[PDB]
Each structure stands twice: as C-alpha cells, then as structure tokens.
Design an enzyme around this catalytic site. Structure first.
Site, PDB file in Angstrom:
ATOM      1  N   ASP A 118     -10.106  14.205   7.458  1.00 41.97           N
ATOM      2  CA  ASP A 118      -9.485  13.096   6.722  1.00 41.97           C
ATOM      3  C   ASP A 118      -9.371  13.417   5.151  1.00 41.97           C
ATOM      4  O   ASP A 118      -9.369  12.705   4.372  1.00 41.97           O
ATOM      5  CB  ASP A 118     -10.064  11.650   6.838  1.00 41.97           C
ATOM      6  CG  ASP A 118      -9.502  10.607   6.055  1.00 41.97           C
ATOM      7  OD1 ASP A 118      -8.097  10.493   6.082  1.00 41.97           O
ATOM      8  OD2 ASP A 118     -10.236   9.486   5.582  1.00 41.97           O
ATOM      9  N   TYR A 172      -3.940  14.523  -2.879  1.00 44.61           N
ATOM     10  CA  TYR A 172      -4.285  13.998  -1.742  1.00 44.61           C
ATOM     11  C   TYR A 172      -5.374  14.562  -0.835  1.00 44.61           C
ATOM     12  O   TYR A 172      -5.279  15.009   0.330  1.00 44.61           O
ATOM     13  CB  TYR A 172      -3.125  13.819  -0.470  1.00 44.61           C
ATOM     14  CG  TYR A 172      -3.425  12.463   0.251  1.00 44.61           C
ATOM     15  CD1 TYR A 172      -3.438  11.114  -0.374  1.00 44.61           C
ATOM     16  CD2 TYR A 172      -3.255  12.403   1.484  1.00 44.61           C
ATOM     17  CE1 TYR A 172      -3.618  10.323   0.513  1.00 44.61           C
ATOM     18  CE2 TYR A 172      -3.423  11.462   2.360  1.00 44.61           C
ATOM     19  CZ  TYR A 172      -3.627  10.287   1.633  1.00 44.61           C
ATOM     20  OH  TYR A 172      -3.817   8.908   2.466  1.00 44.61           O
ATOM     21  N   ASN A 206      -1.226 -16.006   2.739  1.00 44.09           N
ATOM     22  CA  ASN A 206      -2.579 -15.972   3.360  1.00 44.09           C
ATOM     23  C   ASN A 206      -3.713 -14.696   2.610  1.00 44.09           C
ATOM     24  O   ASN A 206      -4.131 -14.028   3.493  1.00 44.09           O
ATOM     25  CB  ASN A 206      -2.906 -15.744   4.814  1.00 44.09           C
ATOM     26  CG  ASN A 206      -2.221 -17.063   5.640  1.00 44.09           C
ATOM     27  OD1 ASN A 206      -2.862 -17.983   5.378  1.00 44.09           O
ATOM     28  ND2 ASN A 206      -1.334 -16.957   6.295  1.00 44.09           N
ATOM     29  N   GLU A 214      -5.792   6.775  -2.473  1.00 42.48           N
ATOM     30  CA  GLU A 214      -5.892   5.519  -1.493  1.00 42.48           C
ATOM     31  C   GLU A 214      -6.685   4.246  -2.032  1.00 42.48           C
ATOM     32  O   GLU A 214      -5.811   3.282  -1.554  1.00 42.48           O
ATOM     33  CB  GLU A 214      -6.726   6.094  -0.170  1.00 42.48           C
ATOM     34  CG  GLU A 214      -6.058   6.843   0.868  1.00 42.48           C
ATOM     35  CD  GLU A 214      -4.720   6.290   1.305  1.00 42.48           C
ATOM     36  OE1 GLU A 214      -4.499   5.155   1.516  1.00 42.48           O
ATOM     37  OE2 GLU A 214      -3.746   7.129   1.399  1.00 42.48           O
ATOM     38  N   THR A 269      -4.958  -4.815  15.592  1.00 40.75           N
ATOM     39  CA  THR A 269      -5.707  -5.298  17.000  1.00 40.75           C
ATOM     40  C   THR A 269      -5.168  -6.694  17.313  1.00 40.75           C
ATOM     41  O   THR A 269      -5.983  -7.579  16.938  1.00 40.75           O
ATOM     42  CB  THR A 269      -7.125  -5.215  16.855  1.00 40.75           C
ATOM     43  OG1 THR A 269      -7.575  -6.124  15.820  1.00 40.75           O
ATOM     44  CG2 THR A 269      -7.374  -3.916  16.919  1.00 40.75           C
ATOM     45  N   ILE A 305      -7.562  -9.233  18.799  1.00 39.51           N
ATOM     46  CA  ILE A 305      -9.086  -9.539  18.299  1.00 39.51           C
ATOM     47  C   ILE A 305      -8.639 -10.058  17.006  1.00 39.51           C
ATOM     48  O   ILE A 305      -8.069  -9.524  16.205  1.00 39.51           O
ATOM     49  CB  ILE A 305      -9.688  -8.211  18.185  1.00 39.51           C
ATOM     50  CG1 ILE A 305      -9.888  -7.443  19.457  1.00 39.51           C
ATOM     51  CG2 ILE A 305     -11.475  -8.573  17.698  1.00 39.51           C
ATOM     52  CD1 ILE A 305     -10.522  -5.902  18.925  1.00 39.51           C
ATOM     53  N   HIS A 327      -9.549   8.287   3.009  1.00 39.49           N
ATOM     54  CA  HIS A 327      -9.434   6.991   3.357  1.00 39.49           C
ATOM     55  C   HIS A 327     -10.888   6.313   3.870  1.00 39.49           C
ATOM     56  O   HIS A 327     -11.220   5.331   3.939  1.00 39.49           O
ATOM     57  CB  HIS A 327      -8.760   6.826   5.029  1.00 39.49           C
ATOM     58  CG  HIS A 327      -7.315   7.140   4.814  1.00 39.49           C
ATOM     59  ND1 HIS A 327      -6.771   8.339   5.309  1.00 39.49           N
ATOM     60  CD2 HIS A 327      -6.369   6.239   4.604  1.00 39.49           C
ATOM     61  CE1 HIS A 327      -5.608   8.151   5.123  1.00 39.49           C
ATOM     62  NE2 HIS A 327      -5.173   7.310   4.369  1.00 39.49           N
ATOM     63  N   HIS A 384       1.784   4.410  -3.235  1.00 39.66           N
ATOM     64  CA  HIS A 384       1.828   5.718  -3.048  1.00 39.66           C
ATOM     65  C   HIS A 384       2.843   6.301  -3.713  1.00 39.66           C
ATOM     66  O   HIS A 384       2.721   7.586  -4.681  1.00 39.66           O
ATOM     67  CB  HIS A 384       1.614   6.068  -1.485  1.00 39.66           C
ATOM     68  CG  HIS A 384       0.302   6.134  -1.178  1.00 39.66           C
ATOM     69  ND1 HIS A 384      -0.611   6.465  -1.597  1.00 39.66           N
ATOM     70  CD2 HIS A 384       0.056   5.623   0.184  1.00 39.66           C
ATOM     71  CE1 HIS A 384      -1.740   6.389  -0.610  1.00 39.66           C
ATOM     72  NE2 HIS A 384      -1.291   5.776   0.571  1.00 39.66           N
ATOM     73  N   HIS A 419       0.873  -1.285  -0.061  1.00 35.70           N
ATOM     74  CA  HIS A 419      -0.236   0.011   0.077  1.00 35.70           C
ATOM     75  C   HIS A 419       0.930   1.221  -0.040  1.00 35.70           C
ATOM     76  O   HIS A 419       0.706   1.931  -1.063  1.00 35.70           O
ATOM     77  CB  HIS A 419      -0.736  -0.005   1.284  1.00 35.70           C
ATOM     78  CG  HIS A 419      -1.816   1.084   1.408  1.00 35.70           C
ATOM     79  ND1 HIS A 419      -3.110   1.325   1.252  1.00 35.70           N
ATOM     80  CD2 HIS A 419      -1.207   2.238   1.813  1.00 35.70           C
ATOM     81  CE1 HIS A 419      -3.655   2.524   1.438  1.00 35.70           C
ATOM     82  NE2 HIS A 419      -2.498   3.263   1.903  1.00 35.70           N
ATOM     83  N   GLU A 420       2.028   1.331   1.151  1.00 36.84           N
ATOM     84  CA  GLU A 420       2.453   2.504   1.208  1.00 36.84           C
ATOM     85  C   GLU A 420       3.404   2.692  -0.335  1.00 36.84           C
ATOM     86  O   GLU A 420       3.694   3.844  -0.657  1.00 36.84           O
ATOM     87  CB  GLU A 420       3.552   2.644   2.268  1.00 36.84           C
ATOM     88  CG  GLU A 420       2.815   2.551   3.516  1.00 36.84           C
ATOM     89  CD  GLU A 420       1.678   3.461   3.654  1.00 36.84           C
ATOM     90  OE1 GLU A 420       1.531   4.620   3.045  1.00 36.84           O
ATOM     91  OE2 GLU A 420       0.797   3.423   4.562  1.00 36.84           O
TER      92      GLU A 420
END
Ligand SMILES: [Ca+2]
Ligand SMILES: [Ca+2]
Ligand SMILES: [Ca+2]
Ligand SMILES: [Ca+2]
Ligand SMILES: [Zn+2]
Length: 316
Positions: free
Chosen positions: A226, A157, A183, A166, A194, A197, A231, A146, A142-143
């Site tokens: 934002d 942006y 995966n 994005e 997280t 979780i 995003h 950019h 992703h980065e």
C-alpha cells in the site's frame, strides 16, 4: 458544450431524489455552469478509457438505475465545490476555478474511486463489497480533496507523506459530510460499503483500530504494501484530527475538543501554507501548531489541544 443552463431531477444511488444543474443543447448534458468553469460528468460505459462521453440525456429526468451514479457524482462534486468556496474561500481545486470532471461506470465490478491527476473516476463496485462509489459524499469529497492537496502541498503518495495525503482527504471528506448534514459521522464510506452489512465502514476516524488500522505512532506499519501504508498509517492522523475536534482521552492523554470548524481552519492552513511534498508526521505536527498559533495565538486553548492530540497519538 455551449447551451442553456437548466435544472433537472433524478435519483441517486441510495434512492434519494435531488435536483441537478444541467445544460441544454438538443440533449440535456450533465454540465453545471453555475460553479466556476463548470462541473462535467462523463459516462465511461464500463471501459477504462477516460474520460468517456459527456453524459447526455433526452428529457432532463435521471431516474434510470444506470443514471444513479452520475447523478450523485455530479451533485456531490457541486456540494464539495460549495464547501471549499463558502468555508475556505477557495475556488475549485486549483484556486482559480478549474473545471471539475468525473467519470462513472468505470470498468466492470471496480471497487474503488480515485483522482487520477486530471479528474475523478468512480467504479460501480461489485455489488457486495461496494455499491457505486459516488453514492457516498465522504468518498466524493475525499477524492476531490486529493486534487486540492496536489495543487497545494503536493504531498508525495509514499510512506508518511502519503499517509498525510490520505488523512487530509479523510478529514475533509468528513467535514464535507458534516457540511451537507448527510447523516454525518466520523466513519469513511459507510453509505457505499458492504450493502449486506449494516453499521460498518471502510475506515473509522474515531477508532481506526476497529478495522485494524493504527491509532498510535508506535503501531505504524513499516513495510512496503500500500505504498508504505498510506491507507493504513493515515489512522494515526485521523485519530489525532478526531481528538482535536471532539476531545477525549486516548492512551491516558486527555484532549479538550475545539470542534469541527476550527479543525478545518487549522488543517486547511497547514495544508496550503506550511506542508510540502516530503512532509512527515513530525512536520505535520509543527505545521498544525504553527497554523493554530497564527489563527488563535500561542497561548490559546486551540494550540494546547493540537499539542495534546498529537502527544496522544505519539507524534512528536
Ligand atoms: Ca432521462
Ligand atoms: Ca454518514
Ligand atoms: Ca462518513
Ligand atoms: Ca455496510
Ligand atoms: Zn485517497
């Protein structure tokens, strides 16, 4: 630095072992000379000063917990470079083999990662919202994407052009995840988000609304947060891209999937050939239709599916 190319071994953020390309000159450095003008990984030492120190190690083994984010930043940058080269015939992010630099251990408890115009930067997370962000191959890709976008379309942006910016990064981050067979899924950041979780992620492409992001143009965010929702509104394009690849019926509109490989080819062409810094969603649709047209013919199933996908998310 100048030295001898070699291969070291270490363990990534998720505890998996991998080989990494290093350079030997008194110390072993995280400098991969096998790809373009090099991949260089730096230690920011919990400060915000960049880039920091080229990562130096005494024995070419990277099993310390402090080492883990560097191992993954360095390795996944290599994988992302291979994806752009093997799949799209693009040499690094600028197309002429520019050196790829990353810093890890940026600041303290920093829950983000970013391309800053010259290099990638990865926080360690606070240990509950995120673990070190380079642990996710969709995050690294992703980065880095950019950077690709900045040297090609130059999407600003802000507002719709920034949502596209994005979404492109989410789309290619995901394609790179599938390329590595790590995966793979259509979620963003699930490996580092997280750690308490299971089953969640930062964003979903298959169902953006799962986390409150729009999946239809009628639901777009129109305020100022934002940077005008870059995003948030990306969910509309991510959903479109998911439909083009996998197919589905969305708000009563049916889309025949054409698969990941064609999705990547169409979007890469739109990005590098037709999009400009102020492109909006409607222009993205035209760019995507034109790209599939170039590649597969105006009466192809591929063009038809691109049209239905954008109809389904309400982009005309
Ligand atoms: Ca060591
Ligand atoms: Ca995954
Ligand atoms: Ca993912
Ligand atoms: Ca989680
Ligand atoms: Zn981004």
């Amino acid at each position: 630095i100048t030295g001898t190319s070699t291969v070291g071994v270490g363990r990534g953020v998720l505890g998996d072992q991998k080989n990494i390309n290093t350079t030997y000159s008194t110390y072993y450095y995280l400098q991969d000379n096998t790809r373009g003008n090099g991949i260089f990984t730096y230690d920011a030492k919990y400060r915000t000063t960049l880039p920091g120190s080229l990562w130096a190690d005494a024995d070419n083994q990277f099993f310390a917990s402090y080492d883990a984010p560097a191992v993954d930043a360095h390795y996944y940058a290599g994988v992302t470079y291979d994806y752009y080269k093997n799949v799209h015939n693009r040499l690094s992010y600028d197309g002429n083999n520019a050196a790829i630099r990353s810093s890890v251990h940026y600041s303290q408890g920093y829950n983000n990662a970013f391309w800053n115009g010259s290099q990638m930067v990865y926080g360690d997370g606070d240990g509950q919202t995120f673990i070190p962000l380079s642990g996710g191959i969709d995050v690294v890709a992703h980065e880095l994407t950019h950077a690709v976008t900045d040297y090609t379309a130059g999407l600003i942006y802000q507002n719709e052009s920034g949502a596209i910016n994005e979404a492109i990064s989410d789309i290619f981050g995901t394609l790179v995840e599938f390329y590595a067979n790590k995966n793979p899924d259509w979620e963003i950041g699930e490996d580092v988000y997280t750690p308490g979780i299971s089953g969640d992620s930062l964003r979903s492409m298959s169902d953006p609304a799962k986390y409150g992001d729009p999946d239809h143009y009628s639901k777009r965010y129109t305020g100022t947060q934002d940077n005008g929702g870059v995003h948030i509104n990306s969910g509309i394009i991510n959903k479109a891209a998911y439909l083009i690849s996998q197919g589905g019926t969305h708000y009563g509109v049916s889309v025949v999937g054409i698969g990941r490989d064609k999705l990547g080819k169409i979007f890469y062409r739109a990005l590098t050939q037709y999009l400009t810094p102020t492109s909006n969603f409607s222009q993205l649709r035209a760019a995507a239709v034109q790209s599939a047209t170039d590649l597969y013919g105006s009466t192809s199933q591929e063009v038809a599916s691109v049209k239905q996908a954008f109809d389904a998310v309400g982009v005309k």
